[PDB]
């Protein structure tokens, strides 16, 4: 194949190797000027060499460091963007929570006057619980939304009818009436039904999205904590450092040889098949938050849904009075007057009024929401192939080292030169079992890969279910249904140690695993500890999150006390 021209030089000259590695800070006395009268090579073929064993080991470490730099920088970007998506999403929610709250204060102070002003804490208290629910700390928002209307009927009604006496029996009656006469649509119309349904189902869809982004952030952050195997460091030495130790720095690796080496180095790709399903859960959910579960629309609509209920309260005041002064007790005599009511009192200070509507935010607020869901949708989708791109990037960079040539021309194949022909395996560790250059047994994926793969699926199920507007009190079904899911299994370490008269610290006979371990003390889900297990106990380390708890058994040795 075609390639660049070369200068005639002494065959396998190690002086040239010294020029290349001396620039990297290698001690010059570790590299002879000509091939050493020994082989000294263990990872590279065992032949005469320019590398002392120290030089060979330095190259293994240097190539491993170069490898890690290309993976970690691309991972730091993904972690950074996941944090950026998270922060940007939360800031508009916090903003609209505050903007709606002020606009409601302006709306109700003028439209309802003292009826609102004396009770503003109740209306603003709701907003604090909208935020607490968003953070999963105030999940009892549904009861807060029910109590909101009970408090209003208890406290606004006596101000509408202040001629009547309201002992606590009537006040408590008014608070109960709201729950029984909302069924008849009298004290607030159907507004309580509108308010309670829209807010809760929108917030769980948004909360699921926040939880998903955090799940991804923590999945990727620990995926980079998967160590580089010693087999990878040796395969990387075969990739780059070996022809240099043979005194030929011009030979650089075939892309197909490289891809197999790098794919074997990346066991973290066990996260990949659930990474796609996890991002699909976010993407479907993101589309739902654009309109029917748009929180920014919901936030403003709170004002209208409450104002409608308070208008029904004033309109149906006579109808509510008919219930209050029969169910709570008889009417109070009052100094009612006939003929004509007095004219209303006016104020010397200019009074103002305003009206809110259930319209989506406009101009900058509307376009920021539109851009938010565009940035969330495109950036998440593009990073779906991240785990595959890790393998392609490292070997694309290695191709460009020899950009003046093609693999049609001879390239380095680990132990020699030519064109690489064996196949390149796919992704996940399952395909790395078939890897011809760096074989990896898929039976033992790394701990972050095992634990975080589970988290991706749990998030997937919740986000797709919440996309329907379903509460997050559902299940981890992959059918978006109420069927049960998750569970997993756990094992523990039983230990025994006499408390008295001997004071022996606890030690296992054996940890009873699913199979009972060597002591055969198990039954699948059952775990048994046998033998001289007096003064026994157990240590349980949960596998889904690092949590460790202890227990003890009342089997103290005691002796002939």
Numbering used by the authors: 19 to 579
From the paper:
Glypicans (GPCs) are a family of heparan sulfate (HS) proteoglycans that are bound to the cell surface by a glycosylphosphatidylinositol (GPI) anchor. Certain GPCs, such as GPC3 and GPC2, are oncofetal antigens that are expressed in early development and largely silenced in adult normal tissues but upregulated in epithelial solid tumors. We and others have demonstrated that GPC2 is highly expressed in neuroblastoma (NB), one of the deadliest childhood cancers, and minimally expressed in normal tissues, making it an attractive candidate for CAR T cell therapy. We then identified a monoclonal antibody (mAb), which we called CT3, that recognizes tumor-associated exons 3 and 10 of GPC2.
To validate the binding epitope of CT3 on GPC2, we conducted negative stain electron microscopy (EM) to visualize the structure of the GPC2:CT3 antibody-binding fragment (Fab) complex. The representative EM images in Figure 3B show that CT3 formed a stable and rigid complex with GPC2. To obtain maps with a higher local resolution, we performed particle subtraction, followed by additional classifications and three-dimensional (3D) refinement. The final 3D reconstruction, with a resolution of 21 Å, showed that CT3 interacts with epitopes from both exons 10 and 3 of GPC2. Surprisingly, CT3 strongly bound not only to the C-terminal region (exon 10) that was used for immunization but also to the recombinant exon 3 fragment of GPC2, which helps to explain the reduced reactivity of CT3 in normal tissues. First, we determined CT3′s binding to each peptide by ELISA; however, no obvious reactivity to any linear peptide was found, indicating that CT3 may recognize a conformational epitope in exon 3. CT3 showed an appreciably stronger binding to the mixture of peptides 10–11 and peptides 14–15 than other combinations. We predicted that the residues 148–162 (LRDFYGESGEGLDDT), which are found in peptides 14 and 15, could contain the CT3′s epitope in exon 3 of GPC2 based on the EM structure. Interestingly, the helix that comprises peptides 10–11 is close to peptide 14, suggesting that the binding of CT3 to exon 3 needs the interaction between these 2 regions. Overall, we demonstrate that CT3 binds, at least in part, to a region of GPC2 encoded by exon 3, a unique sequence predominantly expressed in tumors but undetectable in most healthy tissues.
